[PDB]
Amino acid sequence: MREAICIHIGQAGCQVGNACWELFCLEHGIQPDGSMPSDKCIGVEDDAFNTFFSETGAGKHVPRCLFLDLEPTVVDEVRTGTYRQLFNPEQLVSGKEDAANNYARGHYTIGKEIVDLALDRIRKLADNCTGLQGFMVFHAVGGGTGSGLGALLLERLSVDYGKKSKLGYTVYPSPQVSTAVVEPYNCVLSTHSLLEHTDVATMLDNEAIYDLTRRSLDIERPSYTNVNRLIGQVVSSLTASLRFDGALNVDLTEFQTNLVPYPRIHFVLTSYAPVVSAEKAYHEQLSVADITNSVFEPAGMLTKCDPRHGKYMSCCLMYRGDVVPKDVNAAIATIKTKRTIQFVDWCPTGFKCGINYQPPTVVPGGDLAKVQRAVCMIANSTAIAEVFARIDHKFDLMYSKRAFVHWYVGEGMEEGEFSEAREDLAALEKDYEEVGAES
Amino acid sequence: AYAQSQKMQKEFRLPMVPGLSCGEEMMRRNYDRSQIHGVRLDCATVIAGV
Amino acid sequence: AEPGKPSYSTFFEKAKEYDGTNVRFFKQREAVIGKNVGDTVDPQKYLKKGDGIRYIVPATHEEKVY
Amino acid sequence: VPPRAPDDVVSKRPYPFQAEINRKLVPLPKDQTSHPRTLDYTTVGFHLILDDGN
Amino acid sequence: PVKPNNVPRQTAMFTRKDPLKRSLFSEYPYMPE
Amino acid sequence: SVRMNASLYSDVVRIERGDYLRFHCEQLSADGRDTQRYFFGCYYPRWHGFYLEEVRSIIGNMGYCELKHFPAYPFDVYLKPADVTAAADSAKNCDADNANATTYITDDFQVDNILVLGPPQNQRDDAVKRFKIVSVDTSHLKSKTFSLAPVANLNSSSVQNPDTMLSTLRAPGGERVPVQLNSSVLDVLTQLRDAYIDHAGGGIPEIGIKAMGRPFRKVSDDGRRWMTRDGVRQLVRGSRAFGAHADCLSDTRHALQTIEDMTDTIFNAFPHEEATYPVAPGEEACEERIDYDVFMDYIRGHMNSTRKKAVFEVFQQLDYDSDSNITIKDIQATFNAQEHPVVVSDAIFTAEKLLKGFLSIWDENQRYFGLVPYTEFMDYYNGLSAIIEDDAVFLGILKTTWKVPNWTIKFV
Amino acid sequence: REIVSCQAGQCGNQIGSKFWEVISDEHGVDPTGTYQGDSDLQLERINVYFDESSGGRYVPRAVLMDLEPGTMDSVRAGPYGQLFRPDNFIFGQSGAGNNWAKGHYTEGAELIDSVLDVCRKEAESCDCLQGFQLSHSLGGGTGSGMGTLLISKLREEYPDRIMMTFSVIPSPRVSDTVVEPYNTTLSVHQLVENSDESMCIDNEALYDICFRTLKLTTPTFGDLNHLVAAVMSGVTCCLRFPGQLNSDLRKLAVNLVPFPRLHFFMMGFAPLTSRGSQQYRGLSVAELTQQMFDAKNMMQAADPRHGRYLTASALFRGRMSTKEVDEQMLNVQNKNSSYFIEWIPNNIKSSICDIPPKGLKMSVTFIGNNTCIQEMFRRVGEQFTGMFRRKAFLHWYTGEGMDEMEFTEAESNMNDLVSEYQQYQDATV
Amino acid sequence: REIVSCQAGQCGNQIGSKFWEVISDEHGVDPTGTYQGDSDLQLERINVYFDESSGGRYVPRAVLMDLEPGTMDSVRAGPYGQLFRPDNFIFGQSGAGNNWAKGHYTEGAELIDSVLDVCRKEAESCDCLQGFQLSHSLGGGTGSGMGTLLISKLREEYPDRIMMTFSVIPSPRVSDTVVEPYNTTLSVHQLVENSDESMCIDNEALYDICFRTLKLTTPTFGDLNHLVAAVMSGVTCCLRFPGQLNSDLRKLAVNLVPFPRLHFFMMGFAPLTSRGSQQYRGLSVAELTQQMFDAKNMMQAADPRHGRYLTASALFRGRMSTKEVDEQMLNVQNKNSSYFIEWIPNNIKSSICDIPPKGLKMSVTFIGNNTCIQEMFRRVGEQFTGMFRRKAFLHWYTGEGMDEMEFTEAESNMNDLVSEYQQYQDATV
């Protein structure tokens, strides 16, 4: 019951999933070897690990995750790391040659010889689940594998699994910094998949996470490890509603109905608070109102897209820990009283609240100070057209004289696919503007 | 054997950081190049004694 | 005519219909037969402009479900 | 014919502290720290419960 | 005098240890209330 | 049926028959990283020559871990001196060394033998290391080697020749130095042990001699956790029985003198490794030192191989990083204080409170916070081995103290 | 996965000899083939460059290949010579005479049968060949002509596999061969039309590095080839060791070659300190990037000031944090947008490897597709016009079977490449 | 199952002498005829080539054949010459003159009755004789003529028994007999209709293998005979020893002879490695396949590049995995379809035996019915036509009783055979 299948695609998805699972194992009680102490279990009928782990008769708790990469450079690290015993030897699928920042290579030449094995692993994960809420795919559309093979896997999953919910946590290209030159191409090519075959899309660009780590975690050397730790914390905060009981329990579709107003309007920004260091934790009034204000501030958000420059459509706040409904409602009221953030006219309430009694647990050697109360934001807002317009401008600049297009053409794509993807993303941005426009 | 112990003991090579080598090969005074390719079938392979 | 290689094979060939399972993963080491090229080398028949070998796989239209 | 001169040999230990120089690809062990989790009702409580009613 | 044969080029690309302002790539403007 | 289980080289599959003795051995050191390593080698009697290899399991091309071998000591006719007493004299002259040198013998390659190859041929080891033979196969052996020299130096087990310390430095091929303790030094050691049981560790003798091991946590290049005179004086001060009123100058001086001559007695009782004086500042100099192992053989009894291996197995199961360190959170999540008789039937202690007390037992590592070294673990179970006599009881205690999965995680 | 390396000519053979010395030191390989290494990660991915034998001896996937067996004798009698396989040595009976025609059509045509016979074996001896890497000099006869013949046949047989050609481009000031313009012009268009990513290296820039960047007293070709060995190891460190942001040869090609003909890059290594200079500089990501983009550190002699960077790539090594490295690699663009290209946002590719080189805190290798290599191409072409206009040193090539219009069509490719570089440098948005 | 061997001429005598050297070493049989081996499998099937006497001495089932008793006495003086039965040495009084005419018609006939008598006695002694075997040279006088006579008479007397023949082919480079074209022409048209299959052995191929591949400074004719005897012994490895996939001489014939006249094969052995190079390589089934299909290891001097493999057979020795021996046979066809015939899917038969030869990890004998035997046939036909046009050395054959019609129809048969191979070389599906 309440299972959610994690699908990590690409290198970035692999490290994000590694962080997510090292957080989940310590959250529930599972050791790095995959076993679970009898004490980390209320009784014979305890089932918190059920949604994320399957209990084997030999005592292991195998995660319900599929790691998937076209090169072994990350799965071998996983199999040499601390969770080799935890992770199933299968459901850890790797290829031989990487797509090498090529959507064409990941979606038309080498992703096609991997997608059916990936689907078989996904099916063997799902048939073990009697109450599967949905899939949670972690990837970065910046690279080649996560864009191409991610799109292929999303398409085939949408084809074969019908109307199962699909949360795509994707690391979009950042407005300023990037680690590729064909990354705008990859993002523009994968945006159609992220729009149609991803039921709810979440933006996790490295930029806002880096700035947040610098300014709030007091970390002079932020890195991918810290970014993935924070992303895993956000994922755990969102999905803990069905893991631990609370005053306002929600499920996947339960917050999806309140989050998604229209089928094409499902891209939602994310934020987390109080994401602060141990030194800063004992210097600040970590109240529910304070953490809610930090959430609604762009400082705490994980995507470089200012909502105060746009209009909110539906904000879902997952509170965890010692929160109280009165504190939640008072925070919501003092957020309405602020005029820096405007809700769309046709959505008077625009607020979903989900309260969970389990406070977040910090990984040892981590950076987040474990705070007794926390809150995560999944907000649908019209401001998100900013990032799509900017990546469209980057794509237009790159494609003005058809640079770097010969690989995409020669690895199994028509020249018109770029134009089709560009017009699809332009239509997406235009429909965000139409829905955000006043009556 | 003590002599066998010293013979086993060997010096481990320094790391080859670029730009820190100083042309050590110039201090050989005899540069005769034995013709080990084309006239030698063994190609000067080194094999230990029995 | 050829019937096509069976699904879920661990044996890989070149330019044939391939199952989506990771068949290439199980390729083992291969013995090759050389072909004489010194005879084909000809100073008169030389390298032209635009004559380089480019690996271009055919592009097949893929329908997108909306 | 004069005999050839012997090849000049460099000393094996030019620097007084050459021994300290490390020659291992991974010299330092990975840094790892751990803190004991605070035991509380949150550790085992607040867990979803399923029973058959039987 | 025998002079070394050096390429006649000079350096042009310079960076810093913590170049960007406050190690924040972009800082959101504040709208008052 | 004969060849169904046969390999490429089974005796039935091969038409040729070979003469060799195949021995698996493991290195002896305080380092858990080294103790994890497994070694295999073989001895050919035709040439009286044996080779040694280390096996490591890391992922191959197919995505799953594979075992492969790294030359630990290449094939060679290794020679040991016939006379350990005359080894020093033979080292002076080349001809005397040749006369004294003898090749190894098949009798040397029995189980539990402690063999020494000399300087390492690989960089995995930084000094001369001892190899304990854990298994021997003589199925393909057809001939028995005999030493040509009249006097024979044979590798022997530590249990085979007790009250001896093996020192690789003094003589090539490994040698045994007897340890002589009189009744005075012996019962002084027992009293020091008992004062540690009472004062540093509280009521619990396990924590008592765990507190003993505190000044002796560093592991040298050759393993063999050493005791310098400063370490011994720290041990005497930690024994804590030698106390004085701080306001009384005469009493303070008397206590200091008692600590000094107690340290002198303890240090001089045990055999000393000769100090080294390297010419260059780079090469490490070692002071006069005694082995923590030979000291603890007397101060807490003798531990047998099964007990030692059970200790190592528990440590390996608790250690996931394969870095010879256990996190305090791992210690917390695996202590089984909750099903403990005292909390369940006796109700003297509560589960959480006993668990947090056990967490407080482990001292903080200066280098890495929240990490429990294998020296920590070995000293703590030295406590249990000292306090109990029955090997079956020790095995049961190790089975029941840690809620470990007991799966076989050794690569072999 | 695996990378197979061929080394042509005396220059390329010495380059590969020092490269294999460096790789053997990095992976802990004794010259006697037996393993001697230090960490587990060394043998996690040693098979990319080494094939194992029955006894565990590791033999490089190296094809030593040249008409003069003297360099073969030198490399095999050297310190790490006993590492190479015997059959991997291919030798003729007479030298190339520094003649592209002799190396490419008369002498190299007879040896190419055995060259390809051993090269196919070494290429299919691995589970998944990533690509080919040929080290050579364009000024010589056997290194340039016969090496490009090998490149053409290897591309014909393996169209999809990636190709690198570490070519040591000559310079008139350091002209160590008078037919260097002819040989270079004949080989550059072969590289253009049959090499996935060439690698231009110039003795002028290496010597400038040795004089001012290193301040070496008497640096010999061993010291000089240490740098090319460093960059050759750096371009595959991502394959050989795990990293936070891994990459590969096809990764570099895709992120660095905007158009098929523009695949020529200029190299650079950092850190690279002078003799008495370590105590005067603190090794950090900032100074790594400063020396990487630093002009004199470019080990190909062409001033980046006069050109604009089409693409750049930085293969950083060592345990780091990605935020500082991409801070540096974005801020360099931010305050040097004049030296970059506007219509390609973020001309820079970044890769991170978790294993630093032997005895270094950090390191980086630079791949630079700067448009100012058109200056080197034009300087080669002008002197090619000078020699070809008077038929000087042309009777050798004509009598070795080649036709005169070969030179004309190669220089036509030169002019086309120069024109493409110029019209992509001056193009606007 | 028993195989009885015949040794025709001095070529056959020395070849069979070294063959019995190899067989005695394999079965642990000393020259005195006793057994000092260390395995039961030596006695398990020792009856295939040996017959035990009353005293336990193992006499080989061998017949020796020569007009020249000089080679007879040399074999007797050999280290293992006492093994053969004294009555199995059949010799004449006059030499063969290196003449097929007097080796097949005049002097061959006066001894053919006695040699048939002794062969018949050997077949009687055999519990159920599976195959006659012959070792000889087509270019000789008595090895060729009397060998053809005996194989023909064996064909009529034993039509249901396998007829192995091991024929040494001449070559212009090695040519040490001016009438090699005549003898080969007169012998090929006998072996076509009198031998079930006939692999060809060529001395320049042997020399090339022992020089370029095996790298012996002074390889002797003795270990050249050892090299041929290795395959001659491995052809019946499954006959003499158990295996997961056994096969015998008829199994080879039926899986290697698509049509009755197309039965001219080539040997191949692996691992044939120079001692100075096999320290550098790791013995494996994959490179055993690489060698067996490699042109330089083809111990008949006719490349497979210009021909298409009708059928092939790989008899592996040593415990192995069936696919690691099977993909190496399959994907070779998959990737070299230009060198394999389409209308014969899976051209290679594989066989596995548990016992490998002495001092080896594992071995393999390759037997290929490649279409390139037409090259040898065309060469010998052209040489024969050149000599026959001027009737050179024809008087030595016509004075012994032949007529030109025999030569004309033998040459016509060989030309039909070369046309016959060419038709399937260029045949379409």
Ligand SMILES: Nc1nc2c(ncn2[C@@H]2O[C@H](COP(=O)(O)OP(=O)(O)OP(=O)(O)O)[C@@H](O)[C@H]2O)c(=O)[nH]1
């Ligand atoms: N959060 C996070 N993002 C990462 C990490 N590693 C890479 N990325 C992001 O991934 C983007 C590029 O994708 P890649 O790293 O190449 O991974 P990929 O999508 O699988 O592409 P390939 O490497 O070609 O397979 C970069 O812009 C990074 O922002 C990581 O460890 N954590």
Ligand SMILES: Nc1ncnc2c1ncn2[C@@H]1O[C@H](COP(=O)(O)OP(=O)(O)OP(=O)(O)O)[C@@H](O)[C@H]1O
């Ligand atoms: N409590 C312990 N549990 C497990 N291993 C230990 C413990 N204490 C020490 N060791 C290690 O076990 C090994 C035993 O050391 P050593 O060979 O000197 O012992 P010994 O007393 O001479 O002989 P024996 O091993 O036969 O008991 C060393 O590597 C030591 O570091």
Ligand SMILES: Nc1nc2c(ncn2[C@@H]2O[C@H](COP(=O)(O)OP(=O)(O)O)[C@@H](O)[C@H]2O)c(=O)[nH]1
């Ligand atoms: N870096 C480096 N360059 C070299 C070396 N040997 C030769 N060269 C360069 O190669 C050019 C001459 O080419 P050459 O070596 O004769 O080519 P070959 O005739 O094909 O072997 C000269 O300009 C040298 O600068 C070497 O060992 N290292």
Ligand SMILES: Nc1nc2c(ncn2[C@@H]2O[C@H](COP(=O)(O)OP(=O)(O)O)[C@@H](O)[C@H]2O)c(=O)[nH]1
């Ligand atoms: N393999 C092998 N070949 C041989 C031997 N003797 C001769 N030959 C080859 O056979 C050819 C000539 O055979 P020949 O001596 O006339 O045979 P003969 O008629 O019995 O004397 C030559 O080309 C030799 O290379 C031998 O003992 N072994």
Ligand SMILES: [Ca+2]
């Ligand atoms: Ca650990």
Ligand SMILES: [Mg+2]
């Ligand atoms: Mg990747």
